[PDB]
Scaffold this active site. Sequence first.
Site, PDB file in Angstrom:
ATOM      1  N   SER A 294       1.052  -1.290   0.127  1.00  0.00           N
ATOM      2  CA  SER A 294       0.221   0.188  -0.123  1.00  0.00           C
ATOM      3  C   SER A 294       0.837   1.338  -0.138  1.00  0.00           C
ATOM      4  O   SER A 294       1.562   1.422  -0.759  1.00  0.00           O
ATOM      5  CB  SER A 294      -0.931  -0.013   1.230  1.00  0.00           C
ATOM      6  OG  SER A 294      -2.091   0.912   1.057  1.00  0.00           O
TER       7      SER A 294
ATOM      8  N   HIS B  31      -3.148  -1.831  -3.697  1.00  0.00           N
ATOM      9  CA  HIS B  31      -4.487  -2.257  -3.813  1.00  0.00           C
ATOM     10  C   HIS B  31      -4.982  -0.511  -4.166  1.00  0.00           C
ATOM     11  O   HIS B  31      -3.968   0.268  -4.159  1.00  0.00           O
ATOM     12  CB  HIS B  31      -5.152  -2.830  -2.732  1.00  0.00           C
ATOM     13  CG  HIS B  31      -4.765  -2.185  -1.366  1.00  0.00           C
ATOM     14  ND1 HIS B  31      -5.014  -2.799  -0.204  1.00  0.00           N
ATOM     15  CD2 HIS B  31      -4.121  -0.892  -1.039  1.00  0.00           C
ATOM     16  CE1 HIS B  31      -4.701  -1.986   0.772  1.00  0.00           C
ATOM     17  NE2 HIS B  31      -4.392  -0.715   0.163  1.00  0.00           N
TER      18      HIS B  31
END
Lengths: 171, 171, 171, 171, 171, 171, 171, 171, 171, 171, 171
Positions: free
Chosen positions: B79, B104
């Site tokens: 992330s 993501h």
Amino acid sequence: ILTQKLIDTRTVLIYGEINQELAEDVSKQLLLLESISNDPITIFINSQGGHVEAGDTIHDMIKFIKPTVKVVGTGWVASAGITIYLAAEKENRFSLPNTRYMIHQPAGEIEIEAKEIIRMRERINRLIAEATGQSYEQISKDTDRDFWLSVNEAKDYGIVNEIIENRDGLK
Amino acid sequence: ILTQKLIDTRTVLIYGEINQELAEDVSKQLLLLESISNDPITIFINSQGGHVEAGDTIHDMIKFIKPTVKVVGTGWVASAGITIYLAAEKENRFSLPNTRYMIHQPAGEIEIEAKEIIRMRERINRLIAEATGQSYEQISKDTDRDFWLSVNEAKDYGIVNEIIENRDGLK
Amino acid sequence: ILTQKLIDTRTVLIYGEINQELAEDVSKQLLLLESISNDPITIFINSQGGHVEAGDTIHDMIKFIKPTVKVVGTGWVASAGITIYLAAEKENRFSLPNTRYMIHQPAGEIEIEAKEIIRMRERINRLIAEATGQSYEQISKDTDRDFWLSVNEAKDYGIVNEIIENRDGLK
Amino acid sequence: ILTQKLIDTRTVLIYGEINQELAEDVSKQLLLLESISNDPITIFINSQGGHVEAGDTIHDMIKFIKPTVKVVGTGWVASAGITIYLAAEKENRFSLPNTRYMIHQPAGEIEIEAKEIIRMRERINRLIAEATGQSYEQISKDTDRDFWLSVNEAKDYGIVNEIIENRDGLK
Amino acid sequence: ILTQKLIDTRTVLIYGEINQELAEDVSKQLLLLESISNDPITIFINSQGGHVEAGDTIHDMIKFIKPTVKVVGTGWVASAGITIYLAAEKENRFSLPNTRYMIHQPAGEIEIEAKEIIRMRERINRLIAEATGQSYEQISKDTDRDFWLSVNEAKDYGIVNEIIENRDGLK
Amino acid sequence: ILTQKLIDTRTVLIYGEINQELAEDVSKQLLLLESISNDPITIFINSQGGHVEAGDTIHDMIKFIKPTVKVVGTGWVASAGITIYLAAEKENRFSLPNTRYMIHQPAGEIEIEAKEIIRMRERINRLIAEATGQSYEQISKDTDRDFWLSVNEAKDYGIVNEIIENRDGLK
Amino acid sequence: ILTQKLIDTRTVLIYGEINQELAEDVSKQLLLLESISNDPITIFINSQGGHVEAGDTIHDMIKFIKPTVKVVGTGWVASAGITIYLAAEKENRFSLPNTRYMIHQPAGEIEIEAKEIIRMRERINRLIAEATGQSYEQISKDTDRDFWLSVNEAKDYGIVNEIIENRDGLK
Amino acid sequence: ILTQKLIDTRTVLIYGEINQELAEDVSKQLLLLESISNDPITIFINSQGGHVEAGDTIHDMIKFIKPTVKVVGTGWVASAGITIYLAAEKENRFSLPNTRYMIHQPAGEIEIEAKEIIRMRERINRLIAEATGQSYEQISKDTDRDFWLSVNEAKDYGIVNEIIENRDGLK
Amino acid sequence: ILTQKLIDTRTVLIYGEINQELAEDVSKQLLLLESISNDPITIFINSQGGHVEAGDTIHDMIKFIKPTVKVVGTGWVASAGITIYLAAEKENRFSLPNTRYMIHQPAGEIEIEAKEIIRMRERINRLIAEATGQSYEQISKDTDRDFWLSVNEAKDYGIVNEIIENRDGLK
Amino acid sequence: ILTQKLIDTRTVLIYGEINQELAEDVSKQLLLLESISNDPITIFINSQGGHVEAGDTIHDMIKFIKPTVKVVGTGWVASAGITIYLAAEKENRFSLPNTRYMIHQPAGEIEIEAKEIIRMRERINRLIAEATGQSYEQISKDTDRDFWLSVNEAKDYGIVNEIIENRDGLK
Amino acid sequence: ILTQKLIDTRTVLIYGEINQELAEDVSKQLLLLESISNDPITIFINSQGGHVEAGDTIHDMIKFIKPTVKVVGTGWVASAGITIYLAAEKENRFSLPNTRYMIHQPAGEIEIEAKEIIRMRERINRLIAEATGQSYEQISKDTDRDFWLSVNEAKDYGIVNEIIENRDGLK
């Protein structure tokens, strides 16, 4: 001059839960000792394990630095602690007499999480096999549940190379 | 003299959750090293991610300072950690063997909040696209859910440039 | 100059609960004193016990270092604290007058856990037998429940060698 | 010598929530750098905002000290953080590429509280108008709800004067 | 050398809640600066108020010490904060532009407590009266509820003497 | 050199709740100042009281040390705080103008506890009587409930000797 | 008249956690229905399991009473729920279509507790073997971990006899 | 006579979270109404969903009992609620005008758990497919995330057969 | 006989927060009164609102049943409460004099939730428009924030038809 | 026959906090008594007040029903309780001797909230003015803070009409 | 028939804390008994006191109702309990032998609260004076602190009229 003579001993203690804070502390010590000389480093490990990726970092840092690293298992070495312990070459893996060892398949969208834990368990089991001399199939079989080994059993299993009581045992 | 020789190693450790406190610490370290010389800086990253805007700050600080920055991925980079990782040029993006990677679309009046999260997800995806060499459409497709990549998969994808095990690998 | 003269006394205090943090602290102190000289080290122990594997580490560290270690029991010495106490050779085991001693079979999937508690209790009882000169069967019987001994009873039992009141008692 | 060279950079970091404790810290830093020389001070701001009166103090302290203050927006600058950001002259207002900006009418016997919040919101809107070159009516209208701006939109609006990626960007 | 240069500026910051801990901190700072020289001391105050008797101490300490004390209100000054602000002579009471001021009758066996709160309110209102030039009767009337004043209203009221924006304002 | 010059002022601050921790802190400060010279010591007291036996210790320590101790009441001085205040000889008992004083009979098997509270109350009242010049009977009557005195009333009552506003008030 | 008609249906619902309170409730209902007539009783079971001995009571009560008991599995039947379900003869064991079944080895001084859990697990497995027609060794092997069966898999296994969707399926 | 007249209406309300307690309650009402007569039963459903196996029980009980069951969706019908709703034949599925409908893949050792959740989702999706007339592949695709349908959309999708406003709509 | 005569009044009270439990209670009462006769039903409503879908059910149930429903607003009628109130025909909408009314746009993966909240607000606003005779445009505008109306303003707006003080006002 | 004869007394007790639950209870009792006969109703009130809108409902319900309502204040009647009390015609307002009365301006986005609190306070004060015969200005002035009245003062004020001690006082 | 014969005894028990809930319960019982006949009522009181205004209500209700009320003190009667006890005529005040009695000045905008507590204490003391035959000045003096009386002392004081042990003592 309190840590000055302690830095000269080229010794790192890894006592307690494996986490990122501990990984950072250990990384800093190993990087410092490397910057000083290429003389061997001795790591004492007393750990029940903890965070997998923290264990991975310490493991890889041990192999990353130039100085040769010796490990001494003490009290207990389990899970993520074992991954760290096994970063040292077999010749350089020691244990104090009152130590037990443990290998197991650690804990970790449910489809994504399941796949990751499977891949993690394969990576860890191949690491243990490569380090101990045991086959991947043997490790996979034994790590089904919490597999506790006494110091003598962990020696026969290929985890511990030499059981030592005194300084000269390290030679 | 304890940190004085560790400053000489030109190394910054980014371990754990990305937040504003870590961003402040990293910013101070990078600014200190820049004020000393224009020699390269090495960053070891072990991060599950965290605060997006803190990640953006560290990312931009890396590009802002004069010295070249090398990054070494270790344990996991996910992330907001990836945003920091991708701040370095592709040539200077390294990884240790036991590392997994993840991209993501991150979490973030409802109409206002919705627009922000969309704009943020675009900005992050375009950042990843530009860095990895992948198309924006490819990143947008892959980041629909938690997209985990092994170290080798991360290499093929364009995140990692070179997997290293030893010091000489940095050359 | 504050701990400088305190280090000269070659004294380690082990007061309170035995845990991994205390084990690390004690380990650092012993390794420091060892690196300075091979002169004898004195340890004062006031401990109800605690973490078994932390006690194991301290016990093994005492035997691992080159300098001879004298122990002085004070207040109470119990459980994992007894394991540490018994690390010293019989002749070097002292007690202050107002001390009581306790040995027992400590606390610690259920089948695996039960096996480990049994093995641990054997290992500890054999350690106590070897150190005191008592038979394993005598220890195993006595440690069935909390077995408290006055200072004079602990001496008769072979835990304490000499009861001392003054400095010159250490001679 | 750790902060000695950091003081030479004449840089202040305002990361995280704006509150009285941060205001005190920033005030001390600004007053210290003022006492050394009249050379410019660079302030990096990453803030979601916070305490209105704490933001007023930092705003006013920036205008109070003799040295010229440059601001660099990073990550996000919102609410009370914007009030701080706008303390610098338009010429001296910079932004890193990955930054978003927000203005709104902040939150804050009920008749007394209502009057205070009205007066406060007027004061803040006039401050923003004066610094951005926008009319009071335009600011008043736009701040009715959370008004987020991208880095380029914030430049078009008159908040950011220059978007910079590197050191020479500050020139 | 970090606070050495800060002590030279002869500046005390009173930020946050007024309490006994802050009163002790401020008292030590004022006594330390008094022991060095008889040069003026500048106090910056950003406070919502707090403990009455703690405010009384700071007020009385400001008058007790030999050096002339200048006060600069910033952000807000309220309740116990006002009592501290008014310790300085009218000529030496300054304000930054973005500041609001508040006076009120503070909060505090029930007969005894009632009498004390009455006397306390009397004492505080007379202190405000003497310092501002306004009558006791007028202060009593105005302090019936939370009496908020803009910076200019506080100036008109006789609390603030001069509103300053720059260093040369203190002259 | 931060407390070095503060030690030269020979000033002790007793601000906040009277407890054993504060009593230890104060004892150390008084013992330090006594060991340096026999010059006078000034104590500023701002206290609501607290632990009786902690107050007893500070009281007795003031009388125990060789140097003459001057006390300055500020904000409030109540209960255990008054016991401390009254340790100084009447001639050396000062007050800042904004200070209130309180005496009362402090709070404390039940037959045992009752006797102890009785004896404690008598002991405290006789101490106040002796130090103020008031009779035991007058003290016992006035201390029946919370007996608050303004600064001027406390002077008349014999607690305070001189009300001072400036440094030269101590002469 | 509300439960009067409900008692005539001779139906008992066992929904939710198996515990002693539920066991008391079920026992009372069974004894009531037995005292009325020897007509068949139908039990619908939706249970995740719970307390082993509570399940044992219900199981034994089902066999103790004179009327014939039919069971209908619904939602899920697991652990202690299965023991209850298997109290009925194979002919009288039904299932609604949307149901899953689970057998496992339940959880339960350590030596004593371990022995009891072993005996309990043998007793339960022998109960399951006898009711399903499977061998003890097969049950012992399958109950090693959570053995979830679909409705069709449970029928094949010998737990469910007949899968019904309608009333006439009971015939 | 309060529930007596209410029993004649042959109406069951399912409002709120689907759980085992509600399943037991609904089961009793359905079994009571079946014992009285074979006349149709109307169920009004306002449910966000809840426990999957509780929903399965209610679904299966509706098909199990002899009387025909009519369902009326009201407010919202989601997840486990939709499963219950779809127990009635298509001709007997009604909706009040102000109702929204949702289908999704519900949430539920990790390998064992992951397999069960997968089987559960397949089972639910087939159930929905069969009842709506949509293909398994379409349902599987649509339920990837929260799939909210308005009343008219649910009608087109085959969930709702008829939208009714008045009693005569049930006819 | 306690509710026997209370059912004869054909009166329903909706007091407090709208939730699914209240919706069930109200639904049961309305169905009970419907099954008794086709005579009108009076509903007194005192509600701040609450759960949107629960309000929807009650609204729809009011229109579903055969009897004509009269509403009497009392104290306050807001949000989901207003939805219920507006289920009655305009001629049948009454208010007691001490009542206030409120309409607003209610609160409610983020893209999905945003879409739902938008659709929900449109559904509610169209419901309000049709019932009051205000245009959808006007309702959409007025519900931007909490829109409180006095009883006379509510009457002018078309929410309330008639304000009554006594029984004969219902006639 | 327990509440049957209590219903014959035509008495309602309103004791304790005014809330929507109590309002519901009271409404049901008033509606029950109204349905029986048009004979007068007596309400005994002992309330500190509570929920404004709940008090509004009870007030309006008292005026709504056909029977004449007498009120008897007992213990205390305050805030919302006073609103209920003043629903009765002046001739019908009684008090027991040991009662006190209180009126005040009750407590209750901030611009919206402030407007509502202002309107509510005006509404309540106008209600009180009309019932007591006092001017709106008098009520508005007196309700600025908690305005407590003894029973005799409440009579003089126009709240209470008659003070009674015995049954025959109601006559 | 359970309370039917208990109602025939015309007995009310006031045991435990005096609060509004108990006041309501007692009020209902007294009003019920009054509606049945004008035969005497006996109240047994065991109460430490509680809510002043609740005690006032019970006191006033005792005098309000037509029947004669006898009180029997038992265990203890204190504070608000005494106010209730003293509602009965002197001739009708009895005590069981094992009972103690206490009067004191009860506890209870600080100026407003103080004024109310003063008035309340006066009202209570006058009530006690009138019922006992003691002067107001005597009651005011004796109630300064907790004033406990044995059963015999309470008789001498005018609180208790007659001490009884058996039924016939009521005669």
